Amino acid sequence: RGSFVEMVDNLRGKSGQGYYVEMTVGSPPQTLNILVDTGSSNFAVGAAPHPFLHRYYQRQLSSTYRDLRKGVYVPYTQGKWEGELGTDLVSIPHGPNVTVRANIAAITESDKFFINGSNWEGILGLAYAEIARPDDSLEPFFDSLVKQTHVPNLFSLQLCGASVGGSMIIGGIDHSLYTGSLWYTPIRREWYYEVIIVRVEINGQDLKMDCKEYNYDKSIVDSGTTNLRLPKKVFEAAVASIKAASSTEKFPDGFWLGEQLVCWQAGTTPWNIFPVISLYLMGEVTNQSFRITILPQQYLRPVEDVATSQDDCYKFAISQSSTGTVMGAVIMEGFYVVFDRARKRIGFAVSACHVHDEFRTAAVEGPFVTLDMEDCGYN
Numbered sequence: 001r002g003s004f005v006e007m008v009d010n011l012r013g014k015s016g017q018g019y020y021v022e023m024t025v026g027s028p029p030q031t032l033n034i035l036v037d038t039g040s041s042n043f044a045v046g047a048a049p050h051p052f053l054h055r056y057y058q059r060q061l062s063s064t065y066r067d068l069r070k071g072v073y074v075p076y077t078q079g080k081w082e083g084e085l086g087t088d089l090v091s092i093p094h095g096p097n098v099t100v101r102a103n104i105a106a107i108t109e110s111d112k113f114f115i116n117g118s119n120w121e122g123i124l125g126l127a128y129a130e131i132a133r134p135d136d137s138l139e140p141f142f143d144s145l146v147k148q149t150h151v152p153n154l155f156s157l158q159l160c161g162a163s164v165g166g167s168m169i170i171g172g173i174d175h176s177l178y179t180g181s182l183w184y185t186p187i188r189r190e191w192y193y194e195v196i197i198v199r200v201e202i203n204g205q206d207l208k209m210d211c212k213e214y215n216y217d218k219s220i221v222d223s224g225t226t227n228l229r230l231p232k233k234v235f236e237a238a239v240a241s242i243k244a245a246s247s248t249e250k251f252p253d254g255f256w257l258g259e260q261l262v263c264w265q266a267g268t269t270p271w272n273i274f275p276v277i278s279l280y281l282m283g284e285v286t287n288q289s290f291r292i293t294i295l296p297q298q299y300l301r302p303v304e305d306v307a308t309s310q311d312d313c314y315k316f317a318i319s320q321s322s323t324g325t326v327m328g329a330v331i332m333e334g335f336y337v338v339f340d341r342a343r344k345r346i347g348f349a350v351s352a353c354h355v356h357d358e359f360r361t362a363a364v365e366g367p368f369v370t371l372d373m374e375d376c377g378y379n
């Protein structure tokens with residue numbers, strides 16, 4: 001408990017392409033880099049020589065592969081993959097010293113799913129069976145892991161942003177990865193890691209919306225999404241308030257919609273003109289909340305691959321949503337995030353690695369008194 005030195009720094013990534021962990025599948029073990037995704041629940045790996053993949057799962061080389069004789073077709077808003085289901089032995093080399101028999105979707109056809117130039121070749125969905133494809137009888141990886149071994153039912157993520165890196169602690173918490181205290185918010189329902197936001201402030205100024213609008217139709221903690229997505233109505237209010245706060249410079253309208261970048265001369269980004277963003281989350285106790293606060297360092301994302309420009313360019317990474325709030329890497333890179341499945345709660349603490357400056361830091365503060373927090377959930 002509290003110290004897992006072998007798992008620290010077991011994540012890597014490149015800006016814009018997400019965080020992955022090394023895993024091995026099959027016997028003899030095949031090593032693959034696997035995107036860590038708390039917003040889905042299938043373990044699905046490339047299994048055919050797609051041109052974007054550095055490597056892929058070759059089932060014929062595995063003596064322990066067992067075919068389930070069942071296909072799965074999985075469309076997303078943008079991507080799709082289709083694959084064949086089976087089980088095989090899986091380990092995490094920088095992980096607990098255990099091997100489990102897990103479900104694996106061997107992806108045989110995909111579109112807009114893999115990223116050209118990325119170093120991962122499959123996804124590890126860490127959310128619950130309720131959103132597994134094709135249905136909830138396909139047991140997710142973490143469920144199998146906890147069933148089959150003595151690993152405690154919790155994991156924790158420290159995503160360190162910009163090469164990016166971080167730690168996924170499987171079965172526990174490493175107190176070196178955060179400062180101050182953890183504050184916990186309840187998992188409202190076990191499908192996505194669904195939470196309830198009860199108040200939103202921009203530079204300490206409350207948006208004063210009906211708090212149900214913050215969770216319309218849900219709010220989730222999602223390591224497989226870059227941005228902070230906000231329900232459209234809330235996005236509209238948030239942007240207006242952020243524009244107002246930063247209005248000491250004028251940026252094209254398109255910037256705020258993520259339709260264009262903004263660039264400054266190297267090392268001169270005016271961080272100070274941009275506001276902090278605070279989300280108050282439902283706490284553990286009736287009428288009690290806490291707040292997490294992020295900086296423009298989290299929500300202005302560096303864009304490196306800009307052959308059009310000499311300068312430091314940034315994308316605004318808060319965006320409007322039709323799927324509810326998504327606390328993606330923009331929120332997670334500020335904090336150490338504990339997915340305490342055993343107690344159905346998510347903890348937040350200020351991350352020891354988050355990017356900040358000499359004036360401001362990400363913050364997790366409590367308690368606050370917030371009434372009618374149960375009304376904030378959308379049904």
Ligand SMILES: C[C@]1(c2cc(NC(=O)c3ccc(C#N)cn3)ccc2F)N=C(N)OC[C@H]1F
Pocket residue numbers: 016017018019035037038039040076079113115222223224225226329
């Ligand atoms: C299954 C799915 C998914 C995520 C990513 N993720 C990424 O490619 C990515 C890219 C950058 C970051 C960051 N930071 C995180 N993830 C790539 C393919 C995917 F199919 N998972 C989530 N959560 O929602 C979208 C959904 F499509």
Ligand code: NA
Pocket residue numbers: 145146147148149150151
């Ligand atoms: Na167990």
Ligand code: NA
Pocket residue numbers: 175176177178179180
């Ligand atoms: Na600590």
